[PDB]
Design a protein around this ligand. Structure first.
Ligand SMILES: Nc1nc2c(ncn2[C@@H]2O[C@@H]3COP(=O)(O)O[C@H]4[C@@H](O)[C@H](n5cnc6c(=O)[nH]c(N)nc65)O[C@@H]4COP(=O)(O)O[C@H]3[C@H]2O)c(=O)[nH]1
Ligand SMILES: Nc1nc2c(ncn2[C@@H]2O[C@@H]3COP(=O)(O)O[C@H]4[C@@H](O)[C@H](n5cnc6c(=O)[nH]c(N)nc65)O[C@@H]4COP(=O)(O)O[C@H]3[C@H]2O)c(=O)[nH]1
Ligand SMILES: Nc1nc2c(ncn2[C@@H]2O[C@@H]3COP(=O)(O)O[C@H]4[C@@H](O)[C@H](n5cnc6c(=O)[nH]c(N)nc65)O[C@@H]4COP(=O)(O)O[C@H]3[C@H]2O)c(=O)[nH]1
Ligand SMILES: Nc1nc2c(ncn2[C@@H]2O[C@@H]3COP(=O)(O)O[C@H]4[C@@H](O)[C@H](n5cnc6c(=O)[nH]c(N)nc65)O[C@@H]4COP(=O)(O)O[C@H]3[C@H]2O)c(=O)[nH]1
Lengths: 109, 109
């Protein structure tokens, strides 16, 4: 097994992006980390390697955070339709902020 | 002069609350800190000591943050209509998160 570079957490979170068939997607996140996220595809075709841009929202410490993110699909389980994604081109302070907030959430667990 | 307990910054930020005359307010923030904020009243009556609840939005490191805050008016300059406010009842992790983000903004300056 591989070490995950960023700890993952399950919290209230959502991704909104425009997908392949020009069909807007609104998906609850299965989990989130400073490196990426997962969600259940339940819809249009999606492939490993696909690049999307969207607005991600999540809540930590009663604060709602949202940012525009680009992501790359890293895996698609054709069975469960679980889609694993990696953020692309996040700025240093942005990644740092994500890490801080997720760590703060973890601290609460 | 008095030392400010929390550093203040000028960033894109907004407060939305329901004011005295039941008149909804949407005001850009003059500045923000982990302790409170200021805005120009330009409208209905408002007094030192007034308590309001609203949704505050601000942007740091390309991330948009919003939270429901209760605030107490600490000062009202009847001339410039500058209103200075103090957050009430923020949770420890919430204050810590605010301090972190504002410090991160300051670091960028
Ligand atoms: N390609 C890919 N798929 C991912 C990734 N994260 C989650 N998944 C998929 O999501 C399933 C379940 O993830 P899990 O709940 O965290 O639960 C996982 C996890 O807790 C653990 N696990 C398995 N392999 C690894 C690993 O290489 N590293 C770590 N840290 N945990 C693993 O075993 C459970 C299931 O393993 P899987 O059969 O692989 O089944 C995984 C896998 O199909 C990922 O970064 N890349
Ligand atoms: N929150 C979240 N982020 C995701 C997910 N899928 C991909 N990412 C993000 O994209 C990076 C690369 O994913 P990977 O190519 O599948 O490459 C993964 C994968 O090969 C493996 N891995 C980690 N966990 C599992 C697992 O539960 N099952 C399996 N089969 N592999 C895993 O370890 C590699 C690196 O893991 P990371 O360091 O965490 O790095 C991940 C992670 O930052 C996801 O389901 N949830
Ligand atoms: N009651 C109250 N009013 C506030 C507060 N913060 C800002 N104001 C009001 O906003 C005006 C300008 O604030 P400033 O731009 O930061 O610019 C300020 C600030 O840079 C500085 N200053 C004056 N007094 C103090 C002080 O006691 N502590 C600090 N740290 N700075 C002060 O002088 C400028 C103007 O002084 P002011 O005449 O008082 O005029 C102040 C004052 O009327 C506050 O925490 N409480
Ligand atoms: N971002 C922001 N927060 C505000 C403002 N007004 C009040 N607050 C928040 O509410 C606390 C108390 O404000 P104060 O009663 O006016 O009590 C103030 C006030 O008496 C004085 N003070 C600070 N700056 C100034 C200033 O520029 N001018 C004057 N006249 N007094 C100041 O120092 C006391 C404590 O300052 P703080 O520690 O900063 O603590 C402030 C601050 O956390 C504001 O305009 N902007």
């Amino acid at each position: 097994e591989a070490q995950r570079q960023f700890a993952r957490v399950k919290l209230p979170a959502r991704i909104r992006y425009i997908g392949a068939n020009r069909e807007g997607v609104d998906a609850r996140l299965l989990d989130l980390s400073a490196g990426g996220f997962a969600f259940t595809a339940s819809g249009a075709p999606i492939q490993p390697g696909d690049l999307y841009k969207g607005k991600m929202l999540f809540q930590v410490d009663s604060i709602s955070f949202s940012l525009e993110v680009e992501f790359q699909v890293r895996s698609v389980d054709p069975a469960s339709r679980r889609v694993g994604c990696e953020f692309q081109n996040l700025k240093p302070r942005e990644v740092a902020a994500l890490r801080y907030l997720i760590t703060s959430y973890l601290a609460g667990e």
